Amino acid sequence: GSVQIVYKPVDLSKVTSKCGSLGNIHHKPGGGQVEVKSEKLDFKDRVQSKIGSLDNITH
Amino acid sequence: GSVQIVYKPVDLSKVTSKCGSLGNIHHKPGGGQVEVKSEKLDFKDRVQSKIGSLDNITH
Amino acid sequence: GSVQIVYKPVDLSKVTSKCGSLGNIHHKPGGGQVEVKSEKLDFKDRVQSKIGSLDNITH
Amino acid sequence: GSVQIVYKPVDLSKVTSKCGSLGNIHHKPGGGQVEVKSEKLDFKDRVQSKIGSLDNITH
Amino acid sequence: GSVQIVYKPVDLSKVTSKCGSLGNIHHKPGGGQVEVKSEKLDFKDRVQSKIGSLDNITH
Amino acid sequence: GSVQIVYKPVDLSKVTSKCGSLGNIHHKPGGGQVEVKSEKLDFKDRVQSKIGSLDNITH
């Protein structure tokens, strides 16, 4: 009777160039498609039929 | 009666170039498609039939 | 009556170039498709039939 | 020098109830997260350094 | 020099109830996460260094 | 110089109930995570260094 989705990713691109130096970074330079879902389905249909008498012939 | 999805990944691209140096990084330069789902299905249908009498012939 | 999915991966690309040096990194430069699911299914249908009398002939 | 992604799935839920009958269907009553990507990356950086003379001491 | 991804799955849930009958179906009532990717990476960096003279001491 | 991924699975859940009968089906009522990838990586970096003279002491 309880759900919880903590989505806490951390990214950290640090560059620290000292005397006369350099250097670059390419942090996840791509793609992605993030879904964070908490779904709940509940199917309780009532498909019923009270005929009473059935006389099929189909010559 | 309880779910929990802690999604806590950590990324850390550090460059530390000292005197007259250099150096780059390519951190996960690709793809991905992240799903973090907590689904719950519940099927409780009632497919019933009370006919009473059935007289099929099908010549 | 309890589930828990702790998803805590760690990535760490460090470069430390000293005097007049260099050096790069290619950290997981590829693909992936991450699913973190906690699903629960529950099937409790009622497929019933009370006919009473059945007279099939099918010449 | 050519890509092509034909994404042609087919779904077909047919019910055909005849004389005094019935019947239901639950076609993929769940989840999903569809990605149809054609990505192309190209990394051609130039990280260069012409110092000329380097005299580090670091007592 | 050519890729092709034909993604042509077929699903077909048919019910055919005749005289006074019934019957249900649960077609893939679950999950999934579909990725159809055609990626191409190309890494051609140039990490170079022309110093000329290097006199490190580090007492 | 050519790839091809034909992904053509077929599913078919048929029920055919005749006179006064019944019957259900549970077709793959579970999970899955489908990846159809055609990736191509190509690493052609140039990590070079022309120093000229190197006099390290490190007391």
Q: What is the DSSP string of chain E?
A: ----EEE--B--EEEEE-TT----EEES-S----EEE--B--B--EE--B-S-B-----
CA dist C42 and C35 (Å) reads 21
Chains that touch C (3 or more CB pairs under 8 A): A, B, D, E, F
Nearest to C44 by CA among B46, E18, E21: B46
Contact flag E56-C20 (C-beta cutoff 8 Å): yes
CA angle, residues C29, C35, C36, in degrees to nearest 5: 125
Interatomic CA distance for residues D32 and C35, integer angstroms: 10
User: What residue type is assigned to position E23 of the chain?
Assistant: G
Note whether E20 contacts A: Cβ–Cβ < 8 A.
yes
Rounded CA gap, A36 and A45, in Å? 29
Give the torsion sign (CA, F27, F28, F29, F35). Answer: negative
Is residue F15 within 8 A of residue D17, CB to CB? The reply is no
The tokens for C41 are 């299914």
Smallest CA–CA distance, residue C57 to chain E, in Å, is: 13
Gyration radius of chain A over CA positions: 31
Strands B25-27, C25-27: pairing kind? parallel
- Please say whether the beta carbons of E20 and A49 come within 8 A: no
CB contact under 8 A, D19 and A45: no
Q: At A38, phi and psi to the nearest 5?
A: -130, 85
Q: In 3D, which of F21, D23, B47, D21 has the Cα closest to residue A47?
A: B47
Total number of residues shown for chain E: 59
Pick the closest to residue E37 from C36, D11, F7 (CA basis): F7
Q: How was this structure determined?
A: cryo-EM
Kindly state whether B7 is in contact with chain D, defined as any CB-CB distance less than 8 angstroms.
no
- Overall resolution, Å: 2.5
Compute φ and ψ for B26, nearest 5 degrees: -130, 90
Query: Quick one: tokens of C56?
Result: 């099939």
HSE of C21 in the Cβ direction (CA atoms, 13 Å)? Answer: 13
Best of D41, D46, D53, D58 to disrupt the A interface by mutation (most A CBs within 10 Å)?
A: D41
Decide if F46 contacts E46 (C-beta within 8 A): yes
How far apart (Å, rounded) are the C-alpha atoms in residues B39 and D31?
8
Amino acid at D31: G
Contact (CB, 8 A) for E54 and C19? yes
Phi-psi map region of A57: left, alpha, beta (phi>0 left; psi -120 to 50 alpha): alpha
Assess F58–C contact: CB distance below 8 Å, yes or no.
Answer: no
**Would you state the structure tokens that stand for residue D54, as one six-digit string?**
């380097």
Side chain identity at A29, as an amino acid letter? Answer: P
Q: Distance between CA A28 and CA F3 in Å, rounded?
A: 26
- Inter-chain contact E33–C35, Cβ cutoff 8 Å? yes
Contact (CB, 8 A) for A47 and B47: yes
* Cβ pair B31, A30 in contact under 8 A: yes
Q: Do C37 and B34 touch (CB under 8 A)?
A: no
Distance between CA atoms of B32 and B42, rounded to whole angstroms?
31
What's the rounded Cα separation, in Å, for the pair D12 and B22? 59
The alpha carbon of C27 is separated from its chain's Cα centroid by a whole number of angstroms, namely 24
Which residue type sits at C20? G
Residue A26: φ, ψ to 5°: -130, 90
Please state, in angstroms and as integers, the Cα–Cα distance from residue F40 to each residue in A26, D41, E5, E40, F35, following that order: 19, 10, 14, 5, 15
Contacts of D23 in chain F (CB under 8 A): 15, 17
How many C-beta neighbours within 10 Å does residue F10 have?
10
β-strands D35-37, C35-37 pairing = unpaired
**DSSP conformation letters of D16-45:** EE-TT----EEES-S----EEE--B--B--
Amino acid at B36: V
CA distances from E27 to B38, D11, D16, D29, F29 (A): 20, 11, 17, 8, 7
**Which of B9, B30, B40 faces C7 most closely, judged by CB atoms?**
B9
Taking the C-alpha atoms of residue A42 and residue C38, their distance in angstroms, rounded to an integer, is: 17
Residues just before a chain gap in chain C (C–N exceeding 2.5 Å) are none
* Cα C22 to the center of its chain, rounded Å: 40
3-state SS assignment for residue B48:
coil
| E32 in Cβ contact with D30 (< 8 Å) | yes
Asked if C27's CB is within 8 angstroms of B26's CB, the reply is yes
Contact D43 B22 (CB under 8 A): no
Nearest to E17 among D23, D45, D55 (CB): D23
Sheet of E5-7: strands edge to edge? Answer: D5-7, E5-7, F5-7
Choose from B25, B35, B40, B57 for mutation: most chain C CBs within 10 A: B25
Q: Do C19 and D51 touch (CB under 8 A)?
A: no
Among F13, F33, F49, F51, most E C-beta atoms within 10 A, so best to mutate, is F13
